[PDB]
């Protein structure tokens, strides 16, 4: 069978992560499900004008803009992790990126 009692191919931590990076930066699909994003949009409008409707095109535009902002922040976070001689990203790296960009 598998060279005797053995185990799955068992890729080391990171290799299938770069596989996800390679396959997932080129397929340009949407990374957050639409109904939870719309539910979060409707939640944070409850401290706002309550009886407010949201168009499907507006929901898609907001989802795409937030997705692009989040992946730009994640690029900044990864560059800050490499900056700190590290591989994993920390919330303090997010705080540093937001403060340097002017949003913190």
């Amino acid at each position: 069978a598998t060279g005797g009692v053995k185990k799955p191919h068992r890729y080391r931590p990171g290799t299938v992560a770069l596989r996800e990076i390679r396959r997932y930066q080129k397929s340009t699909e949407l990374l957050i499900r639409k109904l939870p994003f719309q539910r979060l949009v409707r939640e944070i409008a409850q401290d706002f004008k309550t009886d407010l409707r949201f168009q499907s095109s507006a929901v898609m535009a907001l989802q795409e803009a937030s997705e692009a902002y989040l992946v730009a922040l994640f690029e900044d976070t990864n560059l800050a992790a490499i900056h700190a001689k590290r591989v994993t990203i920390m919330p303090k790296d997010i705080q540093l990126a937001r403060r340097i960009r002017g949003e913190r």
């Binding site: 069978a1 598998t2 185990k7 799955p8």
Partner: peptide, 9 residues
């Protein structure tokens, strides 16, 4: 049946 792990099917 895939008992515990998928293995080589």
């Amino acid at each position: 049946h895939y008992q515990g792990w998928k293995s080589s099917w």
